Amino acid sequence: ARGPKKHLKRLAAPHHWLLDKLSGCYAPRPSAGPHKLRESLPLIVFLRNRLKYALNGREVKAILMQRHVKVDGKVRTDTTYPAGFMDVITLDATNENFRLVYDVKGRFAVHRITDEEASYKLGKVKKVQLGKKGVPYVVTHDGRTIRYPDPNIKVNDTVKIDLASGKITDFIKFDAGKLVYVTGGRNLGRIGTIVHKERHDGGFDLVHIKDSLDNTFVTRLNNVFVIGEQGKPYISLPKGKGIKLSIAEERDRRRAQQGL
């Protein structure tokens, strides 16, 4: 290739979008933006495929150009704008708010939230450094840069951000006994508490997690996102609390309830 690529063939798209095989030759390619391509969710997929508010790609554009949809409090009109983990989406008519968060299968859920919670989002701290003239700043996973952080904040900590003004109001240290959300790999979507951490100089650190049914699993540190103290999430959790079930357990519950 002689430059950047503009098209994404279907089948090459991320599997968690749950596109069907046969309806066309192509898939929507996400624009450059706050989140990585492989793990974003384009607005067209949200409005059309999940909420069913639109029948066509054409009807999605008719919605956006009326300026009904805003993301993190700002109006967006690009059909392929890449929303991602922890973003807040608001539809003013209908009076609905959603937060993007994973099901335990590792798919973006349709999760409704109150008008109160729509004020803020969480952010994972990716680096902390001095800028020009010696002013310190922090960088979050969604690419915000915030001036004059509290001197205690360090990498891997988590930070609470007011969506108006865009300023830090609280933070939590990375430490044992915190709640965590897993955001990558085979265990994507599980929740548990930190048991301990393994140092590997020049390598990748590993973290040991325990869930409330005291199953245990291990993941690379890059996949771990802190979300609160033990038993006290800073945000409303999706239905099912991130508890993984075996295939035998799922079959029993369905035919018990759905099968009466």
């Binding site: 279907r10 089948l11 095989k21 046969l22 066309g24 030759c25 075996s246 295939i247 035998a248 079959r251």
Partner: protein, 185 residues
Amino acid sequence: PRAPRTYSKTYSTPKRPYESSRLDAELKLAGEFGLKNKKEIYRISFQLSKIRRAARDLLTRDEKDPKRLFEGNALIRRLVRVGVLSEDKKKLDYVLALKVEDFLERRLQTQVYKLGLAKSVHHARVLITQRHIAVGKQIVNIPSFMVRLDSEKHIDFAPTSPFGGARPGRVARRNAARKAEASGE
């Protein structure tokens, strides 16, 4: 281009063509159940072959292996639903004892004979293809349709036919008209 459509072949051919003893056994089934081809027999033995392959594999796994529990129960459940396996023989070792006649016995073509309605397996086939039989509300016209145990209560003549309550057919109507017209002569 669009993603490929998948497809697969549904029958297997016997590897020795002129094994005389086999030719006799096949012809008795076709005469008994009113089949039109050997292929209709090959299709069934092909399905039965794969069921045994899967079951025989699972029996190498220990009991209380989670995979043997999950998939073994599914297979048994699925055969009981169509009535191929008795709910008394509801155990995996008995799956290896099934034979071809257990499946042919469940085809819609033969059930419509055992219930009455028709009066030979040859008469039964004609009615199905000519759209006279319904299962529930739906008209069905495929003889090889496997009748699940629930459906047997609901096999009856279609509402939109003679024998089911509709108008007489095209030939009956023609005869009445000519005779009526002649009776006016």
